[PDB]
Design a protein around this nucleic acid. Structure first.
Ligand SMILES: Cc1cc2nc3c(=O)[nH]c(=O)nc-3n(C[C@H](O)[C@H](O)[C@H](O)COP(=O)(O)O)c2cc1C
Length: 315
RNA sequence: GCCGAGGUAGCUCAGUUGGUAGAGCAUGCGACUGAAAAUCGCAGUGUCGGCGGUUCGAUUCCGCCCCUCGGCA
């Protein structure tokens, strides 16, 4: 039993184990997702570097990308061992890299392939195998086509469908595919109405917790990506209102704990910028936030963070 | 001439071991205590130096070519 009500979207070059730990200091309940991790990188690459994460990041789900059923079943078997509570399948990445590899959003073209992929992964691991998909391809999406492909996946085992509510135009850039196609959140709402036994987590364009709450009164969950990264404290009230916990974090308290987390990591071989480049938005839209962001991007050291914290305390 | 170590936004630069490329300062527009300081948001644009090599595909790895650099000659 997992809590799908709220989560931070998987974002390449964003949601590494460092930023995930940061978000965990802001919200205890919010579900975290790893970056898209290709199956071949899990099978042949340094597995400790890729998948190893901290136990504080629980709950956390490893998202895998691929096309070969046997390769994704082996990659899901490996992810489960590292302790991931969930193995999510990437069916939305419209990059040129994805199209050439035949994985991501272009996998939606072939339900027969996607269904044998899901059957293999689900039987290879005991953790819930989910999916993060898009509404369709080349703006040719129909509601009966999306509901029909969701039916097939559900018969393959899938229970949770994290839906990025917008089509993927393979011709456009990746940054263009997250701003141009129309957001049909109402399509996901109807997916819950046609499939009340399934869990749907709508996603796309959610700017605040107030908007996320609106969508929660219609579907099971909401996923925020750029809203969280651009300013982690967009989930400031997430715990208290969504997860019903009695705790509201302070931007300064979180900075104090992120400093101690930076001391452990740096002191055991972690480059200081690997942790500091994700703390720049901690004071976004706050007094003297500029100087906080300047100090860390210039110094890039524990000592620099100590002087930046001291200033924030003075202010 | 042997070599250290580099070519990424205008700028000083990150990118840790092939997989949805971006930090800072500075340009530009904007919010605000009254113009105004202080303060903050918004967006920006990439042939990741050119040529082949592997690959599903490499800013990332090979060889070649190639501009500023530093000790040795
Ligand atoms: C920088 C960036 C990287 C992303 N990488 C992934 C990814 O690796 N896997 C994935 O399923 N979605 C990825 N996405 C898409 C997000 O998961 C999400 O669907 C999209 O940002 C829209 O949701 P949002 O408006 O709440 O951010 C990425 C988005 C961004 C902005």
């Amino acid at each position: 039993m997992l809590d799908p009500r709220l989560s931070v979207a998987p974002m390449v070059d964003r949601t590494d184990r460092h930023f995930r730990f940061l978000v965990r200091q802001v919200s205890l309940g919010v579900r975290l997702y790893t970056e898209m991790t290709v199956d071949q990188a899990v099978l042949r690459g340094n597995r400790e570097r890729l998948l190893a994460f901290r136990p504080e990041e629980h709950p956390i789900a490893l998202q895998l990308a691929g096309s070969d059923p046997k390769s994704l079943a082996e990659a899901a078997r490996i992810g489960e061992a590292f302790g991931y509570d969930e193995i999510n399948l990437n069916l939305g990445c419209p990059s040129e890299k994805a199209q050439e590899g035949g994985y991501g959003a272009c996998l939606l073209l072939d339900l027969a392939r996607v269904r044998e992929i899901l059957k293999a992964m689900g039987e290879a691991v005991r953790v819930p195998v989910t999916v993060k998909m898009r509404l369709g391809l080349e703006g040719k999406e129909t509601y009966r086509g999306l509901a029909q492909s969701v039916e097939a996946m559900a018969e393959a085992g899938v229970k949770v469908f994290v839906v990025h509510a917008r089509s993927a135009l393979l011709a456009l850039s990746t940054k263009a595919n997250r701003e141009i196609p129309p957001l049909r959140h109402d399509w996901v709402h109807r997916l819950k109405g046609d499939f009340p036994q399934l869990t749907f987590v709508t996603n796309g364009g959610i700017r605040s917790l107030e908007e996320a709450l609106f969508h929660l009164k219609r579907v099971d969950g909401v996923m925020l990506g750029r809203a969280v990264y651009e300013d982690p404290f967009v989930l400031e009230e997430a715990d208290r209102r969504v997860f019903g916990l009695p705790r509201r974090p302070s931007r300064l308290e979180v900075a104090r704990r992120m400093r101690a987390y930076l001391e452990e990591e740096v002191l055991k071989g972690t480059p200081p910028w690997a942790v500091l480049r994700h703390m720049l938005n901690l004071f976004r839209g706050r007094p003297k936030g500029r100087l906080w962001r300047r100090l860390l991007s210039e110094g890039r050291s524990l000592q620099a963070l100590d002087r930046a914290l001291r200033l924030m305390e003075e202010e």
